Structures are given as structure tokens and as C-alpha cells.
């Protein structure tokens, strides 16, 4: 009998769950504590959400150890687990207008992608990663056949324990499923520390599993403070695995728990500085458009998006002045409004956090080729900014903006390794990109970039079986791929003899 302040918004009764779903039920935090959520389109508040404490971390990793151990999920055969996980996708996509508008409402994400991605892109990873439940294998090798005896082996892939779930702030709901598939499938159960700014898409998901009847205590979400609930899950002895994506900061401090508390594996992701090295030889009509889609996607709140958009001289002002036109083409409106092409940032201070970045570089001597300050309306709409020719020593060409701020640079006509060593030199080593058509110019674009997905001639390809991770300065541990069930599952050995 969970309570909801029923929100008949966007032609649908939005019920975004408030409680802390634990032990089979949604419940409040310590003493009926709470934590609100913000309407980023206006700065408004939406509703009340309980915010757990260190009172709860004693409860989640002990109550979600029920599903792991005793009930249905702990032991049911390989089929119905996926077959139950698969039925989730049956209910969920039916209610995309729930997860579309909600994530259109929670994190202000535009409705146009709120339908395609914010439910659709989740519908895929439910069914692609619900695959390997009854399909995962041993691989068991030729042990020493010890004469005069006869030997054997069979290693295997086994679940680990209980896991940590730190969804980032930017992509709240869809990046729940991207970490609700590779975690549950490996045999274990989950306990989620969502983003509390937009936790209402996250908490909305588990209610469907309620009807969907997954074994009790298999999935439990947990809003909370920044580094208490995270740390309290970051140090508990019971927890076995840990999922997070966010700043570069939290890890080097959170990764000191893992040197101490319980040596359990770690899974952290950091934002990046993808250099999108556009030559001019590619089709200039698409060198700008998908180039313009390369950065300004989903109002700039893109995880890997390339904020250093190199261009050859021959098309720069061309690419600029055309893109300069394209910077004007966008729509700023209600994300649930179909025509909306640009919405507000996630949060209030962050629009500040982006603007000074603009202000930083502009003071350096940066060609503020448009905007750079807040769109003059409630919420935190920001003017899509376009710098120019900013070299590396400046502060804008090193910091992660976290905004739709196209921050160009430039090089010599046809350069391969030098300026791309201005694409190679950034320590944020997540993504990359390139455009080209003569691929005697894509033979040296993708070999040498020490990046984690060394694209060529495209970008923006959020698709389920693209196995993904990051290199040095944005984490380790791969998501959205087969290795996702490479670490999540523990390797046993055996060694018989007769």
C-alpha cells in the first residue's frame, strides 16, 4: 500500500516512488527523513522523497542478502530468471510515457529523446542483457593429465555477492538499466544509490518489478546524501561489489575504502575530454550537423561528448559560420514539448558551474562567438556557446565543461599526429571521434589515440552490445558489453584425479 501524491501530469498519472524499497516493500528513511527533487526546467520542486541514513546501509546490504540467499532468486533455474527479468521489459516499455515524461520531468530531459532513449534505449538493454542468464558458459582447460593417473578440470562463472549502485546524476533512468542488467544477471542481487537530484526516474523503475514480482530483496534503491550513503555503502563489510559513475573526485577518496574496508572489486567511471578530430575531407554538410550533434546532444548533458572539436583551416569559419547558424537553429522549451530542442541543465548551481567556464576562457582571450551566459528564463536554460581557436594551456581547453559548449581548436591543413597529440595529450581518456572519407586519413586517426572507443566516421551510438569502458583518468571496468559479465562473475577452479 505504497503512498503516492498522484501527479496527473503530461496526460498520465505520474507516481514517482518516494520511499526506500527494502525487504520487499517501499519504506521511508530514518525517522521519516526525506530529500526533495528539483524541477530543472523552472527550478521548481516536484515532491517529497525520503533520504536514508547510515541506519539504512545496515538494512539494505542485510535485507537484499535475502534474495541472494534463500528466496526464489537465490536458487531458481537459469530459465525463469531471465524469463522473469524478460517480463520486466514486457511491463516497462508499455509505460514509456511514465519513464519518458518522468525523466522528461525529473532530469528535464527533452521528450523527443525521452521516448526514444529514456524508455526505448532502456527497452533494448533489458532484452539484450536478459539474454545471457541461461546462456553463460564455463571454459575448462587441459589440466596436467598426470600419468600414471588421469586428471580433469572444470572452471566456471559464479555470482559474487552484493553490489554497490551509484547511478550518476546526468543520465538518471536509462543508466539505471545499463547497470540493472549486468549486475542482476550474474547470480547476485542489487542495491541502488541513485542520484537524489533526479531520483524519481530511478525510484520509479522498481515499482514495476513489484507487479513484475521479481524475487524479494533482489532490487533495492536508496536515495541519500552525497558521501554518507555512498561512503556508508563504500565501507560496509557485507557489500561485495560497487557501481558508480560521476566526478573524477569521489573515487581517489572512495578508492581508499577499497584499500581498507573489504578488498572487494571496484567499478567507477569519470567524465571525459573526447577530442573529436574533424578533418575537412568528410562531407562538410555532415561535418557540421553530426558534428553539431556530436556535442549539443540532449542539451549538452552528454557523458562522453567531445568538447574539443578540432577542424582543419579550410572549413573552420565555414564549419563555424554554418554551425554558427546551427547554434541558432535550436529550440529552447519544455523538454516534454515536442518542439523543444534545448532544455535547462540538471541543476541550479551547475549552470553557474558552466558559465564561469565560459567566463574563464573568455577572460583568457577566448573568442566568445556567441552567448556564454544564462538563457533569461526560469529554470537554468543556457545559451549554446561557441568559442574558437582556444589553445591547450587555457582553462577551458583542459577542464570538463559539463555543458553544450562547443569549444573548438585548430591545426594545420591535413595534420595527423601533432594536433591529434592535442587530441592525444588530454588525460581524460574515455571517448574519441573522427570524420573523414579518404581513409588514408583514418589509418592514423584511430590507431594512436589512447582512448577507450577509438571511433571513426561516427559517434553518438548508444547501443546495447557496444561494450564500453574508460581508460586511465576516467575509471576502470567496462559497461554495456560482454566483459560486463566478465568481472561480475567469479572464476572458480577444480582439479580432479583418477
Ligand X SMILES: Cc1cc2c(C(C)C)c(O)c(O)c(C=O)c2c(O)c1-c1c(C)cc2c(C(C)C)c(O)c(O)c(C=O)c2c1O
Map residues 437-466 to x or -, x wherever contact with a second copy holds by CB under 8 A. Answer: xxxx-xxx-xx----xxxxxxx--x-x-xx
Contact present, 35 and 223 (Cβ < 8 Å) = yes
The three grid cell numbers given for residue 55, joined into one nine-digit string: 541506519
Q: Is 472 annotated as a binding residue?
A: no
Task: Indicate which residue of 97, 98, 207, 269 is catalytic.
Answer: 269
Query: Which residues are registered as beta bridge partners of 487?
Result: none
Q: 368 phi and psi, to 5 degrees?
A: -75, 80
Interface residue with a second copy among 72, 265, 353, 410 (CB under 8 A) is 265
Q: Which does 135 bind (CB under 5 to 8 A by kind): a second copy, ligand X, none?
A: a second copy
Q: Is 93 in the site for a second copy (CB under 8 A)?
A: no
Q: Is 227 in the site for a second copy (CB under 8 A)?
A: no
Q: Is 417 in the site for a second copy (CB under 8 A)?
A: no
Query: Which residues are registered as beta bridge partners of 382?
Result: 374
Residues 121-140 that bind a second copy (CB under 8 A): 127-128, 131, 134-140
Q: Which does 461 bind (CB under 5 to 8 A by kind): ligand X, a second copy, none?
A: a second copy
Nearer to a second copy by Cβ, of 406 and 464: the residue is: 464
Query: Looking at 206-214, 245-253, 279-287, 442-450, which segment touches ligand X (CB under 6 A)?
Result: 442-450
Query: Cis omega (within 30 of 0) on the bond before 415?
Result: no
Q: Is 447 in the site for ligand X (CB under 6 A)?
A: yes
CA pseudo-torsion sign 427, 433, 438, 439: positive
Q: Which does 74 bind (CB under 5 to 8 A by kind): a second copy, ligand X, none?
A: ligand X
Map residues 197-226 to x or -, x wherever contact with a second copy holds by CB under 8 A. Answer: ------------------------------
Nearer to a second copy by Cβ, of 95 and 348: the residue is: 95
The three grid cell numbers given for residue 449, joined into one nine-digit string: 589515440
Query: Strands 12-14, 243-246: parallel, antiparallel or unpaired by DSSP?
Result: unpaired
Please give the biggest Cα pair distance in the chain: 84
Query: Strands 490-492, 156-158: parallel, antiparallel or unpaired by DSSP?
Result: antiparallel
Question: b or e along 74-98 (b: 16 or more beta carbons within 10 Å of the residue's beta carbon)?
Answer: beeeeeebbebbbbbbeebbeebbb
Nearer to ligand X by Cβ, of 46 and 434: the residue is: 434
Task: Indicate which residue of 133, 163, 183, 303 is catalytic.
Answer: 303
For residue 416, give every residue at least 6 positions away whose Cβ sits within 8 Å of its Cβ, in sequence order, or none: 441, 444, 445
Residues 282-341 that bind a second copy (CB under 8 A): none
Establish whether 269 is a catalytic residue.
yes
Establish whether 303 is a catalytic residue.
yes
Q: Is 223 annotated as a binding residue?
A: no
d(CA 217, CA 25): 9
Contact present, 324 and 369 (Cβ < 8 Å) = yes
Residues 23-82 that bind ligand X (CB under 6 A): 74-75, 77-78
d(CA 26, CA 49): 11
Q: Is 401 annotated as a binding residue?
A: yes
Q: Is 307 annotated as a binding residue?
A: no
d(CA 327, CA 374): 15
Query: Which residues are registered as beta bridge partners of 165?
Result: 192, 243
Nearest approach, Cβ of residue 443 and ligand X (Å): 5
The SS3 of residue 437 is coil
Q: Is 286 in the site for ligand X (CB under 6 A)?
A: no
The three grid cell numbers given for residue 64, joined into one nine-digit string: 537484499
Q: Is 475 in the site for a second copy (CB under 8 A)?
A: yes
Q: Which residues are catalytic?
A: 269, 303
| Binding-site sequence positions | 167-169, 193-196, 226-231, 246-247, 269-270, 353, 400-402
Q: Which residues bind ligand X (CB under 6 A)?
A: 74-75, 77-78, 145, 150, 152, 156, 158, 187, 443, 446-447, 492, 494
Amino acid at each position: 500500500s505504497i503512498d503516492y501524491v498522484e501527479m496527473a501530469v503530461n496526460k498520465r498519472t505520474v507516481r514517482m516512488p518516494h520511499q526506500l524499497f527494502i525487504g520487499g516493500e517501499f519504506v521511508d528513511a530514518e525517522g521519516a527523513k526525506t530529500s526533495e527533487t528539483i524541477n530543472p526546467t523552472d527550478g521548481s520542486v516536484i515532491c517529497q522523497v525520503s533520504l536514508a541514513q547510515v541506519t539504512d546501509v545496515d538494512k539494505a546490504v542485510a535485507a537484499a542478502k535475502d534474495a541472494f540467499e534463500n528466496g526464489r532468486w537465490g536458487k531458481i533455474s537459469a530459465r525463469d530468471r531471465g524469463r522473469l527479468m524478460y517480463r520486466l521489459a514486457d511491463l516497462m516499455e508499455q509505460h514509456q510515457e511514465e519513464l519518458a515524461t518522468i525523466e522528461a520531468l525529473d532530469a528535464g530531459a527533452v521528450y523527443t529523446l525521452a521516448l526514444k532513449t529514456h524508455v526505448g534505449m532502456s527497452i533494448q538493454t533489458f532484452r539484450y542483457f536478459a539474454g545471457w542468464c541461461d546462456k553463460i558458459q564455463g571454459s575448462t582447460i587441459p589440466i596436467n593429465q598426470a600419468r600414471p593417473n588421469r586428471n580433469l578440470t572444470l572452471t566456471r562463472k559464479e555470482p559474487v555477492g552484493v553490489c554497490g549502485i551509484i547511478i550518476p546524476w546526468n543520465y538518471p533512468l536509462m543508466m539505471l538499466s545499463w547497470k540493472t542488467a549486468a549486475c542482476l544477471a550474474a547470480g547476485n542481487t542489487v542495491v541502488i544509490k541513485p542520484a537524489q537530484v533526479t531520483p524519481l526516474t530511478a525510484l520509479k523503475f522498481a515499482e514495476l518489478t513489484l507487479k513484475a514480482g521479481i524475487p524479494k530483496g533482489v532490487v533495492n534503491v536508496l536515495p541519500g546524501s552525497g558521501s554518507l550513503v555512498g561512503q556508508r555503502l563504500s565501507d560496509h563489510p557485507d557489500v561485495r561489489k560497487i557501481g558508480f559513475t560521476g566526478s573524477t573526485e569521489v573515487g581517489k577518496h572512495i578508492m581508499k575504502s577499497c584499500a581498507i574496508s573489504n578488498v572487494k572489486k571496484v567499478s567507477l567511471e569519470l567524465g571525459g575530454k573526447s577530442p573529436l578530430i574533424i578533418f575537412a575531407d568528410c562531407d562538410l554538410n555532415k561535418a557540421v550537423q553530426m558534428g553539431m550533434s556530436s556535442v549539443f546532444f540532449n542539451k549538452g548533458e552528454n557523458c562522453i561528448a567531445a568538447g574539443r572539436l578540432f577542424v582543419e583551416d579550410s572549413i573552420h569559419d565555414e564549419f563555424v559560420r554554418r554551425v554558427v547558424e546551427e547554434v541558432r537553429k535550436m529550440k529552447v522549451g519544455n523538454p516534454l514539448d515536442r518542439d523543444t530542442d534545448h532544455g535547462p541543465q540538471n541543476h541550479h548551481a551547475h549552470l553557474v558551474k558552466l558559465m564561469e567556464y565560459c567566463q574563464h576562457g573568455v577572460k583568457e582571450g577566448a573568442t566568445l562567438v556567441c552567448g556564454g551566459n544564462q538563457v533569461p528564463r526560469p529554470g537554468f536554460f543556457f545559451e549554446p556557446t561557441v568559442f574558437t581557436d582556444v589553445e591547450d594551456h587555457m582553462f577551458i581547453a583542459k577542464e570538463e565543461s559539463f555543458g553544450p559548449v562547443m569549444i573548438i581548436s585548430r591545426f594545420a591543413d591535413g595534420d595527423l599526429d601533432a594536433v591529434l597529440s592535442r587530441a592525444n595529450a588530454t588525460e581524460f581518456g574515455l571517448a574519441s571521434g573522427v570524420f573523414t572519407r579518404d581513409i588514408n586519413k583514418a589509418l592514423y586517426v584511430s590507431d594512436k589515440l589512447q582512448a577507450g572507443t577509438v571511433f571513426v566516421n561516427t559517434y553518438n551510438k548508444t547501443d546495447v552490445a557496444a561494450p564500453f569502458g574508460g581508460f586511465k583518468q576516467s575509471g576502470f571496468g567496462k559497461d554495456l558489453g560482454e566483459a560486463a559479465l566478465n568481472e561480475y562473475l567469479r572464476v572458480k577452479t577444480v582439479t580432479f584425479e583418477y
